[PDB]
Amino acid sequence: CDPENGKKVYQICSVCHSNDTTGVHGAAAPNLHGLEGRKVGSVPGFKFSSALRDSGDTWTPQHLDKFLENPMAVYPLTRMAFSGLKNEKDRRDVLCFLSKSS
Numbered sequence: 001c002d003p004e005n006g007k008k009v010y011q012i013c014s015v016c017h018s019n020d021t022t023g024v025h026g027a028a029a030p031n032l033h034g035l036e037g038r039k040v041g042s043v044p045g046f047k048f049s050s051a052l053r054d055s056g057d058t059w060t061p062q063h064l065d066k067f068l069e070n071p072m073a074v075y076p077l078t079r080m081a082f083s084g085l086k087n088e089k090d091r092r093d094v095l096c097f098l099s100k101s102s
């Protein structure tokens with residue numbers, strides 16, 4: 001995993017999402033600070049779709065990788081309008097950039 005490539009890949013997420021210490025969500029999507037290991041659809045102050053609002057899943061690396069590859073294959077009714085990252089390197093790299101160690 002190359003977190004440097006990951007930061008570049010992440011530019012596709014950064015208009016919808018925020019990712020900072022402020023707790024404030026992005027223009028269209030939740031703050032991704034603290035994502036790794038977080039319960040799905042739980043960060044306060046963001047109105048999730050019913051699928052994510054009602055989920056008991058956790059954003060493990062394995063669950064995040066599946067979701068980034070094809071969001072509606074994991075949560076069909078999601079409001080995330082994103083086709084998915086089909087390149088395995090780009091998924092692993094952006095996950096690496098999104099890790100707590102980053």
Ligand code: HEC
Nearest residue numbers: 012013016028029030040041048049052078079080081082
């Ligand atoms: C706008 C067009 C988006 C782009 C581009 C990306 N995401 Fe997104 N994401 C978006 C919305 C509107 C939502 C909420 C969905 C719902 O059904 O309520 C999300 C949600 C996520 C989550 C779940 C967060 C949680 O706290 O459970 C994750 C992990 C996520 N998005 C990641 C992500 C990444 C890594 C992206 C770039 C590759 C990305 N999103 C793009 C809107 C949009």
